[PDB]
Amino acid sequence: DILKATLGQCWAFPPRFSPDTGVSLTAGVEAVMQSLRVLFMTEPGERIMRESYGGGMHDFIFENITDELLANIHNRIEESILRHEPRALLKDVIIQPDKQEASRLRAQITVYLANIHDGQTLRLL
Amino acid sequence: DILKATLGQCWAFPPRFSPDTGVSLTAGVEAVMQSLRVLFMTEPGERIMRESYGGGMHDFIFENITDELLANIHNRIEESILRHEPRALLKDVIIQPDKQEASRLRAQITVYLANIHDGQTLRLL
Amino acid sequence: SLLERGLSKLTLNAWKDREGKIPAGSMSAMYNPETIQLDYQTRFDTEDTINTASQSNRYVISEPVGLNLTLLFDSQMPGNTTPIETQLAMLKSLCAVDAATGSPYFLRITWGKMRWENKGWFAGRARDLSVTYTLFDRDATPLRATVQLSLVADESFVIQQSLKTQSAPDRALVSVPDLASLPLLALSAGGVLASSVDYLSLAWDNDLDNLDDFQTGDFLRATK
Amino acid sequence: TFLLEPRTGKGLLNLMAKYTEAVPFAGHTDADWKDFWMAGCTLEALSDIYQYPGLAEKKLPVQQAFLLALLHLLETPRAMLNTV
C-alpha cells in the first residue's frame, strides 16, 4: 500500500478504456516496470518536443553479435536508465543469442527498486 | 578510602535489594571492574537511546579460531575500552582456546588503574 | 601464527560520517601490498628574536600521518575468476566524492596483526589514487590493475578525546615514598599533570597540618 | 481553575505508600516492600524533600532519589493532561 503511495500512479501502457471503469491505471512497483517497457519501445525522435526520450535499440539491428555489439547494448541500456528512469537502479543486464532459431538477441534487464569466493579453492588443482 | 573518593560510587551490576540495606553499592576500584563486566555483557542496540554502548562480542561466535579471529577480538576489546571506559587503561589481552573441551575462547583482559632482554644471549647458541 | 597458516588480507572499510554510525561499502583486497609506508612530519619555525640570548624554534602544526600502499589485481590465472572491474568498482567509488553528501568516505584500513600508528586500525580519507591497466583482452576486459593508494590520518573526535583523558585526567593521586618532601611530592605530582602544581596548594587541598604530615604510604590528591 | 488531575507527588507518594505494603520483600519473608521505599523517613518528611530538594543534604537512600526523580518526570505528562 505504501509502495503504491511512494511510487506514483499513472496510466497503463496499452491504453485500455471501458465505459464501466474509466482508465485502467498501473500503480506502484508495476508502474516502474511499465515505464521501462515504454523507454525501450520508444525511439528518439518519435515523441514531439521530447527528442531525448528513447531507448535507441534500433541502432543494433544488423550488427553481428561479435561481442563488440553486446558491450554496446550493455552501455545503451545502462545510460538510458540513468537519463530517463532514475526511479530504478540497474543490477545486471545479460545478453544471449537464442540457441534455437538464432539471430535473436535476448536481453534480461534486472533492476533494483531504488567478496572473493574462497570456496572454489577446494575444487581446483 | 581515597580510591573510593576518586573513583565514583554506583550500584552493583546484579541489582540486589534488601529491606535492611536499601541498594548494594560497588565503589572505588571494584566499580571500575563492575563497569567492565557491564560493557562486554552488553551488546549494541540493547540499551534504548544508547546504541553506541556495547562490547559487541556476539560478532565472533561462529568464526574459527584461525588467528584472524584472535586479532579481531584484540581490536574490539581495545577500541571499546577507549570509547566507553577511559577510567581504565589496557595492559594486555591474552586469548587462548580451551585445551580441555575446546571451542571455548578464553580471554584474560588486564588493565591499568589510569628494553631488549639481554640475558637470553647466554642461553642460545 | 600459533594456530594455523591461512593468510589475512587487508580490508578497506568505509563510512559516511566522521564516526562509525553510517557504514558505506567495504572491500577486502587480494594480493597484499608487500610494503606499507607511513610518513610523519612536524613543522617547526625558527625564532628570529632580536635579543640573541638563545636559539630556538617554535612548534606550528603537525602534518597528518599519510599512508602509502600499492596493490595489484589480476584475473586470468585460473584461480582468479572474479573480473577485476568489480573489485575496482569499489576502490574507484570509495576513494571519491560520495553522491549523497558531497565529501569523501572516511576510510579505515586494517590488517590482521599489524598495529598502525598506535591503534589497530588506520582511519582517514584518500588523498590520491591511480589505476594503470597494463594488460587487456580481445574485447578488452582489463584483467591487470596496479593500484597506487595514498591516505591521510583524520581520526574521529570521540577516539581523539578518549586518548586525551588517558593522559593527565586532571587528578593525580600521588603516593608518598619513604624520606619524602613536598617540593619532591610537587615534582612527582607536576609530572602526572604537567602543570607545575606549586606545593602550597598541595598542603591546602589535602588539609595538611604542618607541611610534613604525610606518613610513607598515604596518598595525596592533586587536581590541576 | 478546574484542573482535571489533582494529586501531585504528595498524592502519588501517598498512593505508593499504600501500594507497596502489599508486596513482600521477596527472598526475605515477613517484610513489606513499603519498608524499602520508606526507610529513613516518614511519608510527610519525604514529601517535604519532594517539594524542597535541599532538605536532603546531597544524601538519602538512592531508591528514594530514584523515586523522586521519577515523580518529577511524571509531573510533565500530568501538566500536558491538565491542559485538556
3-state secondary structure B31-49: HHHHHHHHHHHCCCCCECC
What's the CA angle centered on C62, arms C60 and C64, to 5 degrees? 150
Asked whether D50 and D10 are in contact (CB, 8 A), the reply is: yes
B82 with C159: Cβ contact below 8 A: yes
Q: Which chain B residue has its CA at the smallest distance from C21's CA? A: B52
CA–CA min distance C139, chain B (Å):
39
CA–CA min distance D52, chain B (Å):
23
Dihedral (C-alpha) D23, D29, D32, D38: value to the nearest 10 degrees? -130
Asked whether A81 and A88 are in contact (CB, 8 A), the reply is: yes
Q: D78 in helix, strand or coil? A: helix
Show residues of chain A in contact with C28, CB under 8 Å. Answer: 115-116
Q: C15 in helix, strand or coil? A: strand
Positive or negative torsion for Cα C115, C117, C122, C127 = negative
Total domain count, chain B:
1
Listing DSSP states for A77-103 in one string gives HHHHHHHH-TTS---EEEEEE-SSS-S
What's the CA angle centered on B108, arms B105 and B109, to 5 degrees? 125
* Contacts of the segment D39-43: beta carbons below 8 A, 24+ positions apart: D39/B19, D39/B22, D40/D64, D43/D13, D43/D14, D43/D17
Burial class (CB in 10 A: 0-12, 13-18, 19+), D13: buried
Asked whether A41 and A55 are in contact (CB, 8 A), the reply is: yes
Show residues of chain B in contact with D31, CB under 8 Å. Answer: 19
| Cα–Cα dist C139/C141, whole Å | 6
Q: Is A108 on the interface with C (CB under 8 A)?
A: no
Length of chain B: 125
Range of the domain at A11: 1-125
A67 with C139: Cβ contact below 8 A: yes
Half-sphere exposure of C205 (CA within 13 A, CB side): 17
| Cα–Cα dist B47/D25, whole Å | 28
| Cα–Cα dist C192/D21, whole Å | 53
Q: Is C121 on the interface with B (CB under 8 A)?
A: yes
Length of chain C: 224
CA–CA min distance B24, chain C (Å):
26
Q: Phi then psi for D17, rounded to 5 degrees?
A: -75, -35
- AA identity, residue B17: F
Burial class (CB in 10 A: 0-12, 13-18, 19+), C69: buried
B75 with C3: Cβ contact below 8 A: no
Burial class (CB in 10 A: 0-12, 13-18, 19+), C173: middle
Asked whether B and C share 3 or more beta-carbon pairs under 8 angstroms, the answer is: yes
Distance in Å from the first CA to the final CA of chain A: 53
Q: Is B15 on the interface with D (CB under 8 A)?
A: no
A116 with C82: Cβ contact below 8 A: yes
- What resolution in Å is listed for this PDB structure? 3.1
Q: From the list D31, D32, D61, which residue is nearest B22 (CB)? A: D61
CA–CA min distance D5, chain B (Å):
30
Name the β-bridge partners of C58: C45
Q: Which three cell numbers stand for residue B78?
A: 581495545
Subunits that touch chain D (at least 3 Cβ pairs < 8 angstroms)? Answer: B
Q: Which chain C residues in 2-61 lie under 8 Å from chain A, judged by CB atoms?
A: 28, 30
In this structure, how many other beta carbons lie within 10 angstroms of the beta carbon of residue C212? 11
- AA identity, residue B91: K
Q: Which three cell numbers stand for residue A37?
A: 517497457
CA–CA min distance B101, chain D (Å):
36
Listing DSSP states for C203-214 in one string gives HHHTT-SSS---
| Cα–Cα dist D39/B19, whole Å | 8
Beta carbons within 8 Å of C114's beta carbon, 6+ residues apart: C36
C120 with B78: Cβ contact below 8 A: yes
Written in H, E and C, the secondary structure of D10-21 is HHHHHHHHHHHH
Q: Is C78 on the interface with A (CB under 8 A)?
A: yes
Beta carbons within 8 Å of A20's beta carbon, 6+ residues apart: none
Q: Is A122 on the interface with C (CB under 8 A)?
A: no
| Cα–Cα dist A56/A75, whole Å | 11
Tally of helices (H runs) and strands (E runs) in chain B: 3, 4
Asked whether A23 and A13 are in contact (CB, 8 A), the reply is: no
CA–CA min distance D62, chain B (Å):
7
- Nearest CA to B87 among C224, C166, A90, D16? C166
